[PDB]
Amino acid sequence: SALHWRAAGAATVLLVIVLLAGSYLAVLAERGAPGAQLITYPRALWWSVETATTVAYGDLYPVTLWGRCVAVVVMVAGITSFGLVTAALATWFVGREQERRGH
Amino acid sequence: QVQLQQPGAELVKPGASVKLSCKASGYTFTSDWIHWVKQRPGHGLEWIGEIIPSYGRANYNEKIQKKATLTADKSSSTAFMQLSSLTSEDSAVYYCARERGDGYFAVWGAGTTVTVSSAKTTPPSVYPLAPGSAAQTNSMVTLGCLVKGYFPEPVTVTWNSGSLSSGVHTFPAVLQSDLYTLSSSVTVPSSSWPSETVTCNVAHPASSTKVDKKIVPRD
Amino acid sequence: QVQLQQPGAELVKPGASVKLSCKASGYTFTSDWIHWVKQRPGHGLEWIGEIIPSYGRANYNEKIQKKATLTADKSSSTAFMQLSSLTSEDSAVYYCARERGDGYFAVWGAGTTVTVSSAKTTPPSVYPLAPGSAAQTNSMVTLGCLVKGYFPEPVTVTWNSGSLSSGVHTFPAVLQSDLYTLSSSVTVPSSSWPSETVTCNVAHPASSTKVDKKIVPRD
Amino acid sequence: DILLTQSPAILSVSPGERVSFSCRASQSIGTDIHWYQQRTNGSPRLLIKYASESISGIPSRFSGSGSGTDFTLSINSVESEDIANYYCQQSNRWPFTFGSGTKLEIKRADAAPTVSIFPPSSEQLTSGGASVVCFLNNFYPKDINVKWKIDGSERQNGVLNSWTDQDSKDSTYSMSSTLTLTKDEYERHNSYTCEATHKTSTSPIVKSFNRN
Ligand SMILES: CCCCCCCCCO
Ligand code: NA
> What residue ranges do the domains of chain C occupy?
1-118, 119-217
Amino acid at the residue C147: V
Closest listed ligand to the CA of A53? 2
Short-list B75, B69, B82, B66, CA closest to B21:
B82
Give which of D72, D76, D58 is closest to D21, Cα–Cα: D72
Q: Are the beta carbons of B78 and B53 closer than 8 angstroms?
A: no
Do D118 and D85 belong together in one domain?
no
Rounded-to-10 torsion of CA C42, C43, C48, C54: 60
Q: Which residues of A touch B60 (CB under 8 A)?
A: 32
Q: Where are the alpha helices (DSSP H) in chain C?
A: none
Q: How many CB atoms lie within 10 A of CB C135?
A: 10
Instruction: Tell me if A29 CB under 6 Å of ligand 1.
Output: yes
Q: What is the DSSP letter of C163?
A: T
Are D47 and D120 in the same domain? no
Ligand 1, atom 9, lies closest to the CA of A29
Closest residue CA from atom 10 of ligand 1: A29
Distance in Å, alpha carbon of B46 to nearest chain D alpha carbon: 7
Nearest alpha carbon to residue C58 among C38, C76, C92, C35:
C35
* E strand or H helix at C127: strand C125-129
C-alpha span between D172 and D155 (Å, rounded): 27
Provide the experimental method for this PDB entry: X-ray
DSSP strands (E only) in D76-204? 85-90, 97-98, 102-106, 114-118, 129-139, 144-150, 153-155, 159-163, 173-182, 191-198
Residue D56 zone, left/alpha/beta (φ > 0; ψ -120 to 50; rest): beta
* Residue D132 and residue D104 share a domain: no
The identity of residue B165, as a single letter, is S
- Cα distances (angstroms) measured from residue B11 to each of B86, B89, B126, B202, D61: 11, 14, 21, 19, 41
User: What is the per-residue burial (b if ≥16 Cβ within 10 Å, else e) of B55-78?
Assistant: eebbbbbeeeeebbbbebeeeebb
**Domain range enclosing A85:** 1-103
Closest ligand 1 atom to Cα of A64: 9
Q: Which domain holds residue D12?
A: 1-108
Rounded to the nearest 10 degrees, what angle do helices A3-30 and A65-100 cross at? 170
DSSP annotation of C175 reads: E
Q: Three-state SS for A91?
A: helix
Sheet architecture: strand order including D191-198: D153-155, D144-150, D191-198, D205-210
Helix (H, G, I), strand (E, B) or coil at A67: helix
Same domain, D83 and D20: yes
- Of D108, D136, D152, the one marking the end of a domain is D108
In angstroms, this model's resolution equals 2.0
Cα torsion angle, A88, A94, A98, A101, sign: positive
**Cα separation values, D148 from A102, B127, B176, D177, D191, Å:** 115, 21, 20, 9, 11
Residues with CB under 5 A from ligand 2 (ion): A 54
Please compute Rg for chain A using Cα positions: 18
Q: Return the CATH number at D90.
A: 2.60.40.10
Report in angstroms the alpha-carbon separations of C203 from C150, C211, D109: 11, 7, 47
What sign results for the dihedral spanned by CA atoms D167, D169, D172, D176? negative
DSSP code of residue C45: -
Supply the DSSP string of B115-126, one letter for each residue: EE-SSPPBPPEE
Of D49, D73, D108, which residue constitutes the final position of a domain? D108
Element (H, E) at B200: strand B199-204
Among C215, C213, C2, CA closest to C107: C2
Domain boundary at D75, D108, D141, which?
D108
Domains contained in chain D, number: 2
**Residues D61, D164 share a domain:** no
Alpha-carbon torsion D45, D49, D51, D57, what sign? negative
Question: Are D194 and D115 members of one domain?
Answer: yes
D129-139/C179-189 β-pairing = unpaired
C-alpha triplet C143, C144, C150: angle, nearest 5°: 175
| One-letter amino acid for residue D57 of the chain | G
Q: How many residues in chain D?
A: 212
Residue D23 sits in the same domain as residue D118: no
Please name the residue of chain B whose CA is at the shortest distance from the CA of residue D103.
B44
What is the domain count for chain A?
1
- Mutation target among B29, B30, B31, B70 for the A interface, most CBs of A within 10 A: B31
CA distance C152 to C9: 8
Using the Cα atoms of residue B149, residue B155, residue B159 and residue B165 in order, give the sign of their dihedral: positive
User: Could you tell me if D46 and D99 lie in one domain?
Assistant: yes
Q: State how far residue D65 is from chain C, nearest Cα, in angstroms.
A: 5
Q: Which fold has domain C119-217?
A: Immunoglobulin-like (2.60.40)
- Tell which of D22, D63, D78 to mutate to test the C interface (max C CBs under 10 Å): D63
Of the candidates D97, D127, D125, the one whose C-alpha atom is nearest the C-alpha of residue D187 is D125
Residue C12 CB partners (closer than 8 Å, separation 6+): C18, C83, C86, C90, C114, C115, C116, C117
Of C66, C103, C76, C54, which Cα lies nearest the Cα of C5? Answer: C76
- Written as one string, the DSSP assignment of D19-62 is EEEEEEESS--TT-EEEEEE-TT---EEEEETTTEE-TTS-TTE
Q: Contact at 8 Å (CB) between A27 and A38?
A: yes
